[PDB]
Amino acid sequence: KIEEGKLVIWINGDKGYNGLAEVGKKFEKDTGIKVTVEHPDKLEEKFPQVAATGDGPDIIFWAHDRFGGYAQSGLLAEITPDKAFQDKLYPFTWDAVRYNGKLIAYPIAVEALSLIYNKDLLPNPPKTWEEIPALDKELKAKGKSALMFNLQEPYFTWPLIAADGGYAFKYENGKYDIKDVGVDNAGAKAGLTFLVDLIKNKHMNADTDYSIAEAAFNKGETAMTINGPWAWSNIDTSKVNYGVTVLPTFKGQPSKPFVGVLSAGINAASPNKELAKEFLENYLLTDEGLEAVNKDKPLGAVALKSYEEELAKDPRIAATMENAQKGEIMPNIPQMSAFWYAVRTAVINAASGRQTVDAALAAAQTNAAAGSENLYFQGMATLEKLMKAFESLK
Amino acid sequence: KIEEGKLVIWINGDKGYNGLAEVGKKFEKDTGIKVTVEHPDKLEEKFPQVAATGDGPDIIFWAHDRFGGYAQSGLLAEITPDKAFQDKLYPFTWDAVRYNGKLIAYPIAVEALSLIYNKDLLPNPPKTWEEIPALDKELKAKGKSALMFNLQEPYFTWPLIAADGGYAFKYENGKYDIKDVGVDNAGAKAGLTFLVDLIKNKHMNADTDYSIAEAAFNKGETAMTINGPWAWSNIDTSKVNYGVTVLPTFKGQPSKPFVGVLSAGINAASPNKELAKEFLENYLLTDEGLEAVNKDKPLGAVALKSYEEELAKDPRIAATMENAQKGEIMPNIPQMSAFWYAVRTAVINAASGRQTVDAALAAAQTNAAAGSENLYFQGMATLEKLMKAFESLKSF
Amino acid sequence: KIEEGKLVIWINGDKGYNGLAEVGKKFEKDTGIKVTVEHPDKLEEKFPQVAATGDGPDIIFWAHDRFGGYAQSGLLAEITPDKAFQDKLYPFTWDAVRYNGKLIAYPIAVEALSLIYNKDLLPNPPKTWEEIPALDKELKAKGKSALMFNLQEPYFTWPLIAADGGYAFKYENGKYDIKDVGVDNAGAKAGLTFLVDLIKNKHMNADTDYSIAEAAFNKGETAMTINGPWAWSNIDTSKVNYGVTVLPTFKGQPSKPFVGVLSAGINAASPNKELAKEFLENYLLTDEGLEAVNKDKPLGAVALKSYEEELAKDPRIAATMENAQKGEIMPNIPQMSAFWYAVRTAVINAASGRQTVDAALAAAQTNAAAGSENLYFQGMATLEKLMKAFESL
Amino acid sequence: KIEEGKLVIWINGDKGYNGLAEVGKKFEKDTGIKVTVEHPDKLEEKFPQVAATGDGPDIIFWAHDRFGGYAQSGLLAEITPDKAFQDKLYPFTWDAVRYNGKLIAYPIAVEALSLIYNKDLLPNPPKTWEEIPALDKELKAKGKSALMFNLQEPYFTWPLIAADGGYAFKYENGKYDIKDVGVDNAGAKAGLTFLVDLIKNKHMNADTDYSIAEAAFNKGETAMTINGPWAWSNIDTSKVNYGVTVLPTFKGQPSKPFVGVLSAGINAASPNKELAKEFLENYLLTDEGLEAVNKDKPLGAVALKSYEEELAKDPRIAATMENAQKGEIMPNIPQMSAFWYAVRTAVINAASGRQTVDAALAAAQTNAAAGSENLYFQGMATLEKLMKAFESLK
Amino acid sequence: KIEEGKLVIWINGDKGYNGLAEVGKKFEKDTGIKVTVEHPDKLEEKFPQVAATGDGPDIIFWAHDRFGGYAQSGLLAEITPDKAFQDKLYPFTWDAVRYNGKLIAYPIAVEALSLIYNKDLLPNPPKTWEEIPALDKELKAKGKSALMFNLQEPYFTWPLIAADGGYAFKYENGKYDIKDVGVDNAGAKAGLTFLVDLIKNKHMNADTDYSIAEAAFNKGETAMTINGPWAWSNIDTSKVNYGVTVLPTFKGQPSKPFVGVLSAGINAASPNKELAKEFLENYLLTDEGLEAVNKDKPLGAVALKSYEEELAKDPRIAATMENAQKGEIMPNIPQMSAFWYAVRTAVINAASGRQTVDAALAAAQTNAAAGSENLYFQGMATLEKLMKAFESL
Ligand SMILES: [Zn+2]
């Protein structure tokens, strides 16, 4: 059961939800429709259950990555945006909310990796990876390091790898093709061989995790770390003279990071899909609205072009955008699980020297392409051995 | 092995099998060639085992859907009917007897669903789904129901779902494309939401199965059921005044049931495939032949144009045809196993309301469709039910 | 939770339930306490679910064989009859309502196999199996047969097999030992070898079913069958001149058939256990009570000595008793599945002659003694093989 | 094969392990013999693998419950203390270190459940279970509770159940007999029926787990919890006036809890079984020794009579002892696995009321007790849960 | 395949079957009863198939170890030799042919493991294991080994292990108790720790199989192998000066090898059990009989006292006897399957050093018991692994 004529809205308890509620009152003051905004426990896992049985909210607010899983289950309602409203948003945001060539959510905000540098230590930062080795040995003259970032998690390593040629799955007709993987590409191999070289030349350490990488930059012992908006107010706490800016270009081409787009989805189970649209298109996603939310707790960069330009007076925002603008969107398909697990190993084995670059990426290429093929075989094969125990038994 | 000169046939003990043996003598009385007819028990499951070893009959008679299973194993022999003989039969039947664009069997009968009505209680039948709520409340006012039919088996429910645009697999040129499924499309969603509406309005009950649905119409307690030829002579047993006709049009579009062709294919292990052809082409599949079989136990509709037109003076036959003619041909491919199992569940969850319509059809679309991109979801779907089996042991 | 002060009582819809309800009125009009007697659907399978959860009836009427399964689960109340009330019932019936040396139900009726004979064809019945060959060939000269019974089900064949010394499990000091099986034994081998001889000499057929056995006697084509009280009402209908009497003795030892003891068990979930006892001991199990129930639908012979002596003027009762009195009580322990499964085959294979006597009984000995031992291995073996499959994921 | 002359010890990293190394120095200062005392992680699981292959320590320190598993594998050496040294220890400890009528290990510490009460809220402790209803409704006068303890785990509930007559297995001579189980006895049924009554009457709550029970007493919300020594350092931290005392007596008879004896067993693969004995008998297990270890991290009550009477000047020790002394010693044999599994369920089902008391204890009796007549029923029980697994797939 | 009057015998075509046929004619020429003696393919596995159907031979000749499996299935006939005729055979041979204190077959040939020595290389062989390391070094200086035998099969290793205190299952009054095992005891531990030491000191090698062990002794490259009668005529082939003698004493106690007694029992389906007895008691088991069979193909040692002493003038027979006499009889019970499998592993793990002695024999002890309590324990192992399994996934 979901009542007609009142918008019920779910959104994460750390986001500008009170800022959204203020757009809720302005909505009631114009059309007399009551808006209710809640941050209930594990709302991302709760939504699936209540959305299937016809219950839950009208509008749902979460990372685009989960909305693939919803859209799959048929739990999201398609959106019908006029030509005008798509021009009001950045065009790459729409590529983040397309499931089987259909728009399924309104995009809100953008969250991508950036290169953070200690302005004191490095007044003019490097625009290319290639130059960072040169810069490292200069800073070893003061016993400091040029860069340290989390090497273990491939979320961080991938931006470099992708630059020349690397991709996870290929986007075709507005849908990812799970056969077509870019782990063994010329540029992906080339990228990792460069990153391995940095570790083997001792310009970086294989042990560098998030804990060490942020710690080292924040205590000024390294000149640069890689981390997006979430890590910023830990560097404010250390009061380090810091700038956030574009990631360095490998083989001249920009680093392609992965993006966590905040999106507004409409419940397929809502009767109030028209009000939801009216609200979202013409109240929330305007300079007045996003401001109200942003001012409660900031969104990083935003989907609305007009207001992004105003937020982009802050260069840390304008960098996080330009990096997301140059990067690829996080695939919402669940074959990513297999992709991560393999690439995580390939970095670690190339780091330790358990395998060569080309040898490790080859294992991942096979493990990632055939992750769809792997799970089904483990499934069907265990059911065949289940049937072989019981059918005999009687 | 199989004796040279002598034809041996298997056919089910519900069919006019002695009547068919009489057509076997008509072959012996014209060319001196001997025919044996057997009604062996579980002949459809026996056939695979004896047909692989080289043994069994020359001719087998069974539903085309099972001949997919045989054709795969290579135990049916390809057929060469002249272009003329294809014009002698209805052309849509031939689309039910082809496997990977090659013919394996001669089609005989067509068994499709119809909408049957208690003509006392409603003399002139409803020609849309649209008006069923209106008609239901008319009958409830003195203690009858408009419609009641088996909701559990999707063979019955699917006709409505398919109407506006639903399909199982996309048939192109020669055969079905196993990636392209039509379970989540606009018309399939629309169809089910209408069937859900009937249950949520209390115009019909989610529990209504074959046992209750046939029982209640035969006792006159409801006006209309949906049922094929098999349930005719059980309405004769109750002797309730019944008329059988075309299914009602949803969204102006025809209702589309699945087409159950009784088919005659030929053992690859036969030396006597030419006699088989001679017999089948120019004895069984002739107005004289089918009549002899029909008169032992009736055939419903038939593939042979000339004799269907004679049987179709009976409007109940002519209806069962017109509904098969407007419906979609029953897939012989083994992705139907997945298609049935999932759609069966999606109906039941949409019926109870434990899932929504859209949520259930989405699960079926994923569970039925057999593309590369589905694989991870069918993978995750089996492991999520598997680990729920391991849980049950431990807490006991 | 089962409301206090009031007895709810459950019994099979074919038994004298209205006759019991009248004992219910006599209870209400003497102590002011309401008796509720029901014919609930599948009451034997309903009881386990409701009785474990604390709901259901106070007092329950069923074959003793299921009350083993209940008593094990702890769903029955232990009962305390004075020494006098134990003498009021036949003493062998008490051995049928004992689980792990504890009494768990009151024994009511007795239901045992008897030798039914066509007085027309056989005016005086045979006292030994041994003499049936002599009698048989005389009656083949008349175009008839001396004996036919269901040979498939070992419930029928077993009484003969047991005679000289065969047993399923040994009942010792008021507890069954599942180690001690008597399927391969001097008397069990001897018994079957005699039954095999009858089939090998063509004095019987291996295919003889219940369907054929009843048919043949009731249409007079055979002179004797073995069958308990339930098959009486089909012999009356064909109006055949029939007498029922004690089973023939092999080597001078009694044929030992099996017994279906009707019992009254009390829910451990009852608060009204005192009234239950009061009712059952001093209303139902009295000449007045059982009569009322007996008159609604008859019970064959009965556990209450006093009223059995009145019922026993009917010789069909007095036979069914004397045969139960001389026979073995049905084990309530669930290792019996293994006993049946093996012995069922061993009869059939010895009958057809696919196995010899001693060879078949030996297979059953190993299958029956270690059927108890097998089930746990088949269980643990599938769980260890399941865990090896799930590990792979 | 472990080096001759040098004693090498394992012990859990929570115990007075440096204090034990100090006994290692006093041993080296008396016979010149070198001592290694080590706290390797998961040493209870590590020992099985390394001890079979001939590797690992000479001496191992753990709860006797695991030493059944070791003794089975033949990994412990049989030990010969003179009649005098057996009199130096409490005699009931020896029945905790006896496997197939053979001594395997020297007993050290005792860890038993006790009734700890908030002397502020309840100056005098209750001496009977019977009294708990009376005292419960008294304490609702300030909205307080009489008792809260973990009702899920049968280590806690068993003390009451056993009191009138319940036992797991019967001890006759040196041997526990796995035929004779006491889960369905008059006293075991009576015990649980009383514990059920407390929940039925709402004098206690079915939800009560360790997390809530310890939390609530630490916040002074209730008058008494049940707990062994480990929870003492949590009640000091919250600053609650607590006394430890004897467990309350059901039907007049003692609450009989299970005894968690810390013991030193000696590797059968050690050549230094002579040094091991010399050390343990006449250094560690003397007033001077245990004190040294106790002073690093306290040992609770102890097996050595001599030192226990000095430790027992602390009444909380002397109570914890008295509860072990009046309780039953923790069975080392592996039918306990079955015993726990069933009794865990039977409590929970009798607590919720989904089975009756008698119905649940009967299920556990059948599921646990023996393997001659019971075999068919535990067999039927596993096939019925197996068939419940195949059911789920559909 | 069984006829009345005519005796049909099955025996393996490695044994003196023609020598038995000569006893067949002497039987026909004295009591007029014709013998057929056959060498059927796979007759040990064939017998169960056609002995269950009532057919087969009347009399069958095989190792006593298999007759447990038959007797279980009920396929063997009981034998009644008078008290007098038991004195004619060595009494431990009768202890090989007993199912639940009832005799099933007549024992004919004794077969045990023996210590064979290269007479040239060691004229007087050692009477203790203890001295083998010392004696090995004496031969190592002349580029030879003291001892080599198949270490894979525990049939060979067991003689040493058993000596001090090892047994498989406890024989009490003519019955094996399958719970009571002697694998994890003082003398078994002591035995293996000695044999492990031989491998660890490199006085012997773990890789030694039968193929290598026979090869090495027969080519004279080692001074001693252990092997029974079957391996004699292969040592003749490259005839080294070789002698067979008693096994060495561990801790002063005899080595106890396993004894594979040739035995002759009776089809339960035979009518000719009395002729069978007549033949076996008073024709085959006489000096005249065994000689005739022995002369076709030698049987090594024999059960018949008088003729064994005449065969025993050959010391190689008299050794094979004395070794069987000091050894323990092979159990006919099929729980041996489990016992062997475990001891096979315990050798391998003690050989490699993957387990210690005590660790390995403990695993075997638990693997070897198979009874009421032991099945329950491997059941306990599955429930303990189940509880760990759900938490992990
Ligand atoms: Zn009308």
PDB file of C-alpha atoms in Angstrom, chain B residues 38-154:
ATOM      1  CA  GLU B  38       0.665 -50.962 -30.436  1.00  0.00           C
ATOM      2  CA  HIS B  39      -0.546 -48.855 -27.409  1.00  0.00           C
ATOM      3  CA  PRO B  40       2.545 -49.477 -25.158  1.00  0.00           C
ATOM      4  CA  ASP B  41       2.589 -47.792 -21.703  1.00  0.00           C
ATOM      5  CA  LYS B  42       4.774 -44.589 -21.344  1.00  0.00           C
ATOM      6  CA  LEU B  43       5.516 -44.822 -25.154  1.00  0.00           C
ATOM      7  CA  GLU B  44       6.864 -41.193 -25.188  1.00  0.00           C
ATOM      8  CA  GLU B  45       9.537 -42.053 -22.512  1.00  0.00           C
ATOM      9  CA  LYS B  46      10.048 -45.662 -23.815  1.00  0.00           C
ATOM     10  CA  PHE B  47      10.754 -44.285 -27.383  1.00  0.00           C
ATOM     11  CA  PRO B  48      14.101 -42.534 -26.535  1.00  0.00           C
ATOM     12  CA  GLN B  49      15.627 -45.751 -25.019  1.00  0.00           C
ATOM     13  CA  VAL B  50      14.519 -48.271 -27.740  1.00  0.00           C
ATOM     14  CA  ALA B  51      15.024 -45.699 -30.624  1.00  0.00           C
ATOM     15  CA  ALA B  52      18.733 -45.106 -29.644  1.00  0.00           C
ATOM     16  CA  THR B  53      19.435 -48.935 -29.504  1.00  0.00           C
ATOM     17  CA  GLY B  54      18.006 -49.263 -33.104  1.00  0.00           C
ATOM     18  CA  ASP B  55      14.783 -51.022 -31.852  1.00  0.00           C
ATOM     19  CA  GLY B  56      11.137 -49.763 -31.386  1.00  0.00           C
ATOM     20  CA  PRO B  57       8.527 -48.629 -34.000  1.00  0.00           C
ATOM     21  CA  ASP B  58       8.967 -46.997 -37.455  1.00  0.00           C
ATOM     22  CA  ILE B  59       6.112 -44.470 -36.888  1.00  0.00           C
ATOM     23  CA  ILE B  60       5.499 -42.650 -33.551  1.00  0.00           C
ATOM     24  CA  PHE B  61       2.398 -40.461 -32.787  1.00  0.00           C
ATOM     25  CA  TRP B  62       2.830 -37.771 -30.078  1.00  0.00           C
ATOM     26  CA  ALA B  63       2.689 -33.977 -29.398  1.00  0.00           C
ATOM     27  CA  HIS B  64       5.231 -32.021 -31.561  1.00  0.00           C
ATOM     28  CA  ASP B  65       6.660 -30.397 -28.320  1.00  0.00           C
ATOM     29  CA  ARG B  66       8.263 -33.769 -27.259  1.00  0.00           C
ATOM     30  CA  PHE B  67       9.583 -34.355 -30.906  1.00  0.00           C
ATOM     31  CA  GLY B  68      11.987 -31.424 -30.217  1.00  0.00           C
ATOM     32  CA  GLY B  69      13.594 -33.702 -27.558  1.00  0.00           C
ATOM     33  CA  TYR B  70      13.769 -36.589 -30.113  1.00  0.00           C
ATOM     34  CA  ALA B  71      14.907 -34.460 -33.134  1.00  0.00           C
ATOM     35  CA  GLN B  72      17.789 -33.111 -30.890  1.00  0.00           C
ATOM     36  CA  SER B  73      18.863 -36.750 -30.203  1.00  0.00           C
ATOM     37  CA  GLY B  74      18.551 -37.346 -34.029  1.00  0.00           C
ATOM     38  CA  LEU B  75      16.026 -40.249 -33.665  1.00  0.00           C
ATOM     39  CA  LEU B  76      13.409 -38.707 -36.064  1.00  0.00           C
ATOM     40  CA  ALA B  77      14.088 -38.972 -39.859  1.00  0.00           C
ATOM     41  CA  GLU B  78      13.662 -35.890 -42.138  1.00  0.00           C
ATOM     42  CA  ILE B  79      10.554 -35.861 -44.443  1.00  0.00           C
ATOM     43  CA  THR B  80      10.208 -34.964 -48.238  1.00  0.00           C
ATOM     44  CA  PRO B  81       6.589 -33.908 -48.940  1.00  0.00           C
ATOM     45  CA  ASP B  82       6.072 -32.386 -52.465  1.00  0.00           C
ATOM     46  CA  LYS B  83       5.232 -28.595 -52.573  1.00  0.00           C
ATOM     47  CA  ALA B  84       1.602 -29.675 -53.474  1.00  0.00           C
ATOM     48  CA  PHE B  85       1.135 -31.619 -50.141  1.00  0.00           C
ATOM     49  CA  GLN B  86       2.106 -28.430 -48.135  1.00  0.00           C
ATOM     50  CA  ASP B  87      -0.876 -26.648 -49.910  1.00  0.00           C
ATOM     51  CA  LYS B  88      -3.099 -29.693 -48.897  1.00  0.00           C
ATOM     52  CA  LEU B  89      -2.376 -28.931 -45.172  1.00  0.00           C
ATOM     53  CA  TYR B  90      -2.767 -25.655 -43.181  1.00  0.00           C
ATOM     54  CA  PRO B  91       0.663 -23.906 -43.427  1.00  0.00           C
ATOM     55  CA  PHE B  92       0.942 -22.889 -39.685  1.00  0.00           C
ATOM     56  CA  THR B  93       1.009 -26.626 -38.626  1.00  0.00           C
ATOM     57  CA  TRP B  94       4.316 -27.088 -40.572  1.00  0.00           C
ATOM     58  CA  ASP B  95       5.919 -24.361 -38.352  1.00  0.00           C
ATOM     59  CA  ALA B  96       5.188 -26.773 -35.398  1.00  0.00           C
ATOM     60  CA  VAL B  97       6.926 -29.876 -37.031  1.00  0.00           C
ATOM     61  CA  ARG B  98      10.242 -28.166 -38.192  1.00  0.00           C
ATOM     62  CA  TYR B  99      13.472 -28.467 -36.048  1.00  0.00           C
ATOM     63  CA  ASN B 100      16.453 -26.163 -36.914  1.00  0.00           C
ATOM     64  CA  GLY B 101      14.695 -25.329 -40.263  1.00  0.00           C
ATOM     65  CA  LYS B 102      14.277 -29.076 -41.262  1.00  0.00           C
ATOM     66  CA  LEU B 103      10.898 -31.013 -41.170  1.00  0.00           C
ATOM     67  CA  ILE B 104      10.849 -34.139 -38.847  1.00  0.00           C
ATOM     68  CA  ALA B 105       7.068 -35.056 -38.774  1.00  0.00           C
ATOM     69  CA  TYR B 106       3.689 -34.895 -40.614  1.00  0.00           C
ATOM     70  CA  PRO B 107       1.157 -32.880 -38.512  1.00  0.00           C
ATOM     71  CA  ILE B 108      -2.272 -34.621 -37.836  1.00  0.00           C
ATOM     72  CA  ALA B 109      -4.450 -32.827 -35.183  1.00  0.00           C
ATOM     73  CA  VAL B 110      -4.474 -29.340 -33.525  1.00  0.00           C
ATOM     74  CA  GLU B 111      -5.371 -29.147 -29.790  1.00  0.00           C
ATOM     75  CA  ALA B 112      -5.812 -25.477 -28.653  1.00  0.00           C
ATOM     76  CA  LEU B 113      -7.786 -23.843 -25.764  1.00  0.00           C
ATOM     77  CA  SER B 114     -11.311 -22.310 -26.301  1.00  0.00           C
ATOM     78  CA  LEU B 115     -13.699 -20.217 -24.089  1.00  0.00           C
ATOM     79  CA  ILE B 116     -16.652 -22.577 -23.242  1.00  0.00           C
ATOM     80  CA  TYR B 117     -19.928 -21.045 -21.767  1.00  0.00           C
ATOM     81  CA  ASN B 118     -23.138 -22.513 -20.078  1.00  0.00           C
ATOM     82  CA  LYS B 119     -25.442 -21.280 -22.878  1.00  0.00           C
ATOM     83  CA  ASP B 120     -28.601 -21.317 -20.551  1.00  0.00           C
ATOM     84  CA  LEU B 121     -26.844 -18.875 -18.130  1.00  0.00           C
ATOM     85  CA  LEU B 122     -25.366 -16.642 -20.962  1.00  0.00           C
ATOM     86  CA  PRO B 123     -26.778 -17.332 -24.456  1.00  0.00           C
ATOM     87  CA  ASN B 124     -24.602 -14.847 -26.473  1.00  0.00           C
ATOM     88  CA  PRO B 125     -20.945 -15.008 -25.355  1.00  0.00           C
ATOM     89  CA  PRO B 126     -18.651 -12.074 -24.352  1.00  0.00           C
ATOM     90  CA  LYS B 127     -16.189 -11.097 -27.136  1.00  0.00           C
ATOM     91  CA  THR B 128     -13.955  -8.918 -24.855  1.00  0.00           C
ATOM     92  CA  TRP B 129     -12.117  -9.519 -21.554  1.00  0.00           C
ATOM     93  CA  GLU B 130     -12.769  -5.731 -21.018  1.00  0.00           C
ATOM     94  CA  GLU B 131     -16.465  -6.320 -20.056  1.00  0.00           C
ATOM     95  CA  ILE B 132     -15.894  -9.370 -17.654  1.00  0.00           C
ATOM     96  CA  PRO B 133     -16.260  -7.368 -14.357  1.00  0.00           C
ATOM     97  CA  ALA B 134     -19.603  -5.884 -15.657  1.00  0.00           C
ATOM     98  CA  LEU B 135     -20.870  -9.422 -16.613  1.00  0.00           C
ATOM     99  CA  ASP B 136     -19.585 -10.984 -13.328  1.00  0.00           C
ATOM    100  CA  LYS B 137     -21.703  -8.663 -11.060  1.00  0.00           C
ATOM    101  CA  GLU B 138     -24.815  -9.483 -13.241  1.00  0.00           C
ATOM    102  CA  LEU B 139     -24.320 -13.239 -12.385  1.00  0.00           C
ATOM    103  CA  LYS B 140     -23.330 -12.674  -8.659  1.00  0.00           C
ATOM    104  CA  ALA B 141     -26.785 -11.055  -7.961  1.00  0.00           C
ATOM    105  CA  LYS B 142     -28.374 -14.569  -8.136  1.00  0.00           C
ATOM    106  CA  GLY B 143     -25.529 -16.673  -7.030  1.00  0.00           C
ATOM    107  CA  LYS B 144     -23.327 -17.598 -10.043  1.00  0.00           C
ATOM    108  CA  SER B 145     -19.806 -16.526 -11.255  1.00  0.00           C
ATOM    109  CA  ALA B 146     -18.945 -15.184 -14.804  1.00  0.00           C
ATOM    110  CA  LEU B 147     -15.511 -16.889 -15.244  1.00  0.00           C
ATOM    111  CA  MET B 148     -13.426 -19.560 -13.387  1.00  0.00           C
ATOM    112  CA  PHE B 149     -10.375 -21.354 -14.964  1.00  0.00           C
ATOM    113  CA  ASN B 150      -7.039 -22.936 -13.859  1.00  0.00           C
ATOM    114  CA  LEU B 151      -4.794 -19.972 -12.745  1.00  0.00           C
ATOM    115  CA  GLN B 152      -1.900 -22.198 -11.491  1.00  0.00           C
ATOM    116  CA  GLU B 153      -0.888 -23.697 -14.937  1.00  0.00           C
ATOM    117  CA  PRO B 154       0.108 -20.766 -17.249  1.00  0.00           C
TER     118      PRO B 154
END
